[PDB]
Amino acid sequence: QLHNGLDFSAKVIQGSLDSLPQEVRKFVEGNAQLCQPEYIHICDGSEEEYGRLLAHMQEEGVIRKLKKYDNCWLALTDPRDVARIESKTVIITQEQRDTVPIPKSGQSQLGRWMSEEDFEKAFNARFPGCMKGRTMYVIPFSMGPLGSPLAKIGIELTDSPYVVASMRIMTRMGTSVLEALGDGEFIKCLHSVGCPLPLKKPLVNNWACNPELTLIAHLPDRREIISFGSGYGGNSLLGKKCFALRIASRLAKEEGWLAEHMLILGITNPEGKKKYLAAAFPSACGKTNLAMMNPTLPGWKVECVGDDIAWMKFDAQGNLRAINPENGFFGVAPGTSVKTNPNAIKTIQKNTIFTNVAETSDGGVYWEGIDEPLAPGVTITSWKNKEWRPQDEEPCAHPNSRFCTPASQCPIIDPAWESPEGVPIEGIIFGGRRPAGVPLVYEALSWQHGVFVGAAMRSEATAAAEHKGKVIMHDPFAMRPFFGYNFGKYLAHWLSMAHRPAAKLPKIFHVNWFRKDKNGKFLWPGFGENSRVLEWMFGRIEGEDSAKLTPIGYVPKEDALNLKGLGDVNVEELFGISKEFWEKEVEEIDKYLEDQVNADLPYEIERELRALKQRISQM
Ligand SMILES: Nc1nc2c(ncn2[C@@H]2O[C@H](COP(=O)(O)OP(=O)(O)OP(=O)(O)O)[C@@H](O)[C@H]2O)c(=O)[nH]1
Ligand SMILES: O=C([O-])C(=O)[O-]
Ligand SMILES: [Mn+2]
Ligand SMILES: [Mn+2]
Ligand code: NA
């Protein structure tokens, strides 16, 4: 070097650039040159590091300690930074069609492509100087069990201590991962809240963010993820949606595996027979509650492998094996109670970070549906940091408030949840929020029909992103926000699985926990009662003659579902299938797939469309 090169050793306040693998050092120093942090902190993942970082944020007023619990914390964000923003989430490729199919008219509903040229301009308008006056934290993280050959390692640079703390829970993080990495490749992840000091704009709720310039970008051809302006975990915990769904789904297509928005659970019957199941439901549509359900049926047991992301690959014996690449649960808080999700309540009692929930005056947490009466005199601070009472018009917790909690604390975490070879999946469940028309459970007729059922998924909008109201949206495979490449090609890749050597193709089901009667009341109580539906699925996988053929697939025979203790359920409305509803449903799906998937729609999916239309027509 003729001066100091890109040597940023003088600014390192933890660790050493010298001890980094060469390529990690280059990534760090290149982005230090660009972003101009004051300091560089190389994370070690230690308890000491964690506790001190938390106590620092506390003194600053960035987070509060929840004094009622063992090592739990509460962050309240700027109300502009509360969920994913799909319209600001983009994938960069040379050709648009590699990222999304070209629709018959208008822009794709299956992702958002940005050209290399446009992204360069966007990047230059955001990143230079962005970390001035701040610390750049270097987070070495593993997606998958540490030192597993299945794992994928990343390095996330961020100026947000909230992100460091959340990454420690949600991934395997620290020096151990650098030691496991060695001179290997890693996913390059760059994050900034986009508020260099001195602040050009007023800071809201001590929550640094830049809503106007928020942009969550993926550059799969450069193995980079670059996210600006948002601290919300879906936008800032780059291992999770960005890497483990978007980047990984494209790698998966190329390499013969699958990366999916699915829980993985193990279920054991009263005879001690155990099976694993995967389930894809859209954001805020029930995965975490199923994955750690407490079954109401006696003698059944559920165990949790993962609640959100599954990586799956057929082995040589033909088993579809699944691993959970995450290390924690980043779960929707509202609705969570001892009644609905007791295993989550137990998990989150210690070492948990909450975002955008309410705080009680004795230092506990509160949210809609927590179903815990407070002692007279105890008062509530809403997520907006204002005094709140139960009869107030607005909720005390944001609808997308979250807990972020170690998976190892789940009282029913599966013994094999960190096994590198993964667990053998025998059933795949699809489903979402449909208040009308769609019955409690049905079973696909074949693998190709089941891929069609995944493709045809529709679900009421939730608060997990920017969609408002109760519009029923397409959300194929619960992947609409997450495809890393062209969805037509994704469908072809799923179809191609039918030919894996020795393949033991999982049975495919579709569920609906959310059908309502004419008064808006849920027809099905859900939560632990969903064990009744899992029982039926389990018997179907065992080959039990417990099903009746219908135009949409198989449903339970009369008396097949165990409804003991649920004698008030209206089985007729709940399982009702209307020709008029389904004729309209099939035409809507046909228009969506042909318009949005277009030249890239596989023949087999169009054939399943035709077949469903025909069976409905014979009603
Ligand atoms: N009525 C009803 N509500 C449910 C059921 N399961 C979950 N919910 C509610 O739906 C909301 C979201 O459920 P989660 O299990 O957190 O959803 P998720 O699929 O894990 O969502 P992401 O983490 O955003 O992917 C919570 O408010 C739950 O209480 C159910 O069986 N019936
Ligand atoms: O945060 C999530 O898990 C989501 O939006 O699906
Ligand atoms: Mn999710
Ligand atoms: Mn979840
Ligand atoms: Na705050």
Side-chain angles (χ1 to χ4, degrees):
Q1 55 190 26
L2 287 166
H3 295 285
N4 252 290
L6 278 71
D7 189 355
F8 294 94
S9 288
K11 284 178 179 284
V12 175
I13 57 172
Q14 187 175 280
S16 172
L17 298 172
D18 296 344
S19 77
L20 297 182
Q22 194 218 301
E23 294 310 296
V24 176
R25 179 173 187 148
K26 289 191 158 178
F27 177 55
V28 171
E29 292 188 310
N31 282 300
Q33 184 195 23
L34 163 70
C35 294
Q36 293 169 198
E38 183 71 0
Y39 290 129
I40 296 174
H41 177 120
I42 300 167
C43 299
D44 65 18
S46 70
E47 273 176 38
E48 318 90 76
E49 170 178 83
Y50 187 51
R52 282 181 35 73
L53 201 42
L54 290 166
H56 177 228
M57 286 184 268
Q58 183 186 17
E59 159 67 47
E60 299 221 318
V62 169
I63 70 178
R64 285 179 51 74
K65 193 170 174 53
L66 288 163
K67 75 178 183 187
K68 187 161 193 76
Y69 313 117
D70 175 9
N71 188 40
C72 292
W73 306 83
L74 174 61
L76 302 181
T77 72
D78 184 318
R80 299 177 295 170
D81 187 20
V82 293
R84 286 184 291 96
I85 304 176
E86 299 170 9
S87 71
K88 292 184 172 43
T89 300
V90 298
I91 299 181
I92 285 66
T93 52
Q94 177 179 307
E95 307 292 342
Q96 180 172 17
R97 177 174 286 193
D98 292 321
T99 291
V100 286
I102 310 311
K104 288 188 193 281
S105 166
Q107 318 214 118
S108 186
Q109 276 188 244
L110 289 161
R112 197 159 176 116
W113 171 76
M114 181 177 286
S115 75
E116 297 163 22
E117 286 87 3
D118 287 355
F119 183 71
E120 208 60 36
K121 292 183 192 164
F123 177 86
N124 291 338
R126 286 170 173 74
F127 283 90
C130 71
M131 296 180 190
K132 198 88 164 187
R134 301 199 182 271
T135 294
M136 168 187 284
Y137 296 91
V138 182
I139 307 170
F141 69 92
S142 176
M143 302 309 292
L146 65 131
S148 171
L150 231 304
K152 301 277 283 198
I153 290 170
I155 302 289
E156 179 164 342
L157 314 180
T158 177
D159 51 12
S160 172
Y162 172 89
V163 169
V164 174
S166 299
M167 289 287 288
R168 187 184 195 266
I169 294 167
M170 296 301 302
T171 71
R172 288 86 172 167
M173 195 276 271
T175 304
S176 62
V177 173
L178 294 174
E179 299 178 348
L181 173 61
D183 284 320
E185 292 192 356
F186 54 93
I187 184 74
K188 279 170 188 160
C189 301
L190 172 64
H191 172 258
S192 175
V193 301
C195 290
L197 307 163
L199 291 172
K200 291 188 201 75
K201 272 175 187 166
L203 188 73
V204 183
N205 312 151
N206 283 106
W207 182 267
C209 62
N210 195 148
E212 287 87 358
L213 292 179
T214 292
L215 183 63
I216 302 87
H218 310 73
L219 294 88
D221 293 303
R222 292 172 55 91
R223 313 189 293 103
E224 286 171 5
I225 297 160
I226 299 173
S227 181
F228 192 84
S230 173
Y232 172 72
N235 299 332
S236 64
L237 304 179
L238 304 185
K240 180 176 177 60
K241 305 301 194 177
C242 296
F243 180 51
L245 297 177
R246 306 196 185 88
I247 290 299
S249 64
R250 195 180 92 152
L251 287 176
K253 178 218 163 225
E254 298 159 353
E255 298 166 17
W257 54 280
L258 295 165
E260 299 300 336
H261 190 200
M262 287 176 183
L263 66 87
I264 306 158
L265 65 78
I267 180 163
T268 304
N269 78 359
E271 290 293 293
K273 293 192 197 270
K274 180 175 184 179
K275 297 189 182 305
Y276 296 88
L277 306 177
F281 309 147
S283 312
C285 289
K287 292 183 303 300
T288 291
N289 278 263
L290 187 69
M292 63 194 77
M293 149 204 295
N294 182 42
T296 59
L297 288 188
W300 286 80
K301 193 171 166 168
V302 165
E303 291 166 284
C304 180
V305 168
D307 76 339
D308 192 58
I309 300 168
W311 291 350
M312 309 195 291
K313 187 187 199 297
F314 283 94
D315 66 21
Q317 288 72 218
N319 302 298
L320 176 65
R321 296 218 165 246
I323 60 165
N324 172 16
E326 304 197 285
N327 201 29
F329 313 131
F330 180 74
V332 172
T336 303
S337 71
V338 169
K339 276 182 176 219
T340 56
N341 194 350
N343 293 321
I345 291 297
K346 291 168 165 173
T347 307
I348 70 186
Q349 287 189 50
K350 64 183 174 186
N351 305 315
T352 295
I353 300 170
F354 297 89
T355 307
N356 288 342
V357 304
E359 188 182 346
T360 64
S361 55
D362 65 343
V365 293
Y366 215 74
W367 46 74
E368 284 53 48
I370 195 169
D371 194 34
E372 294 195 48
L374 295 177
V378 173
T379 56
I380 299 166
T381 298
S382 74
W383 76 281
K384 297 184 147 299
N385 202 19
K386 297 173 205 168
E387 198 146 44
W388 186 92
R389 297 185 239 185
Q391 222 211 329
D392 294 5
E393 197 151 59
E394 315 154 32
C396 65
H398 190 274
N400 194 47
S401 61
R402 301 263 168 178
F403 54 79
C404 181
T405 192
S408 66
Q409 291 178 182
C410 179
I412 56 152
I413 199 74
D414 191 83
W417 89 277
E418 301 191 286
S419 175
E421 75 248 287
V423 300
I425 299 303
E426 294 185 44
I428 294 170
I429 313 171
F430 293 121
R433 290 167 181 282
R434 294 299 302 270
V438 175
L440 175 69
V441 60
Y442 66 95
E443 174 187 320
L445 303 166
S446 63
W447 184 253
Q448 305 64 37
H449 182 221
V451 173
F452 166 83
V453 171
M457 285 173 56
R458 297 169 72 200
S459 181
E460 195 175 77
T462 63
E466 75 269 36
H467 304 111
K468 304 303 187 223
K470 293 303 172 183
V471 55
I472 301 297
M473 298 185 64
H474 286 272
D475 201 345
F477 287 69
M479 285 286 288
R480 188 196 71 252
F482 306 121
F483 291 122
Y485 63 106
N486 182 301
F487 171 57
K489 299 308 184 173
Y490 171 98
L491 289 175
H493 181 55
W494 266 84
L495 289 161
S496 76
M497 296 302 162
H499 322 298
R500 283 289 191 272
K504 299 188 199 148
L505 296 176
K507 189 160 291 290
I508 293 168
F509 303 96
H510 192 276
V511 298
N512 184 196
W513 308 150
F514 303 100
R515 203 183 180 154
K516 288 175 176 179
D517 67 19
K518 65 172 181 198
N519 303 314
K521 186 176 150 44
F522 287 126
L523 286 162
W524 182 247
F527 305 101
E529 303 293 4
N530 290 334
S531 65
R532 298 163 189 272
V533 168
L534 305 179
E535 172 176 39
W536 183 73
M537 291 173 176
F538 190 112
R540 285 296 298 163
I541 290 165
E542 295 244 70
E544 299 175 15
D545 186 16
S546 56
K548 169 179 67 156
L549 214 215
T550 79
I552 66 175
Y554 290 104
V555 302
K557 284 185 177 180
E558 193 186 329
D559 303 320
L561 276 184
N562 184 337
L563 297 173
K564 273 97 87 172
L566 292 188
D568 56 343
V569 169
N570 181 359
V571 300
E572 108 230 320
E573 191 180 348
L574 181 53
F575 279 92
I577 299 178
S578 163
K579 186 181 174 173
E580 283 198 1
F581 181 90
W582 282 93
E583 295 179 317
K584 277 137 56 151
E585 190 72 19
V586 304
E587 289 189 347
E588 202 283 336
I589 300 158
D590 190 28
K591 174 167 189 55
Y592 172 75
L593 292 170
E594 296 288 350
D595 286 3
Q596 291 291 320
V597 195
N598 202 7
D600 294 320
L601 186 69
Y603 188 97
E604 294 180 313
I605 302 300
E606 203 266 341
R607 179 167 65 197
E608 289 304 313
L609 235 358
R610 290 141 73 204
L612 174 60
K613 198 175 170 62
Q614 186 69 8
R615 292 189 299 270
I616 298 168
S617 86
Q618 300 303 119
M619 288 176 87

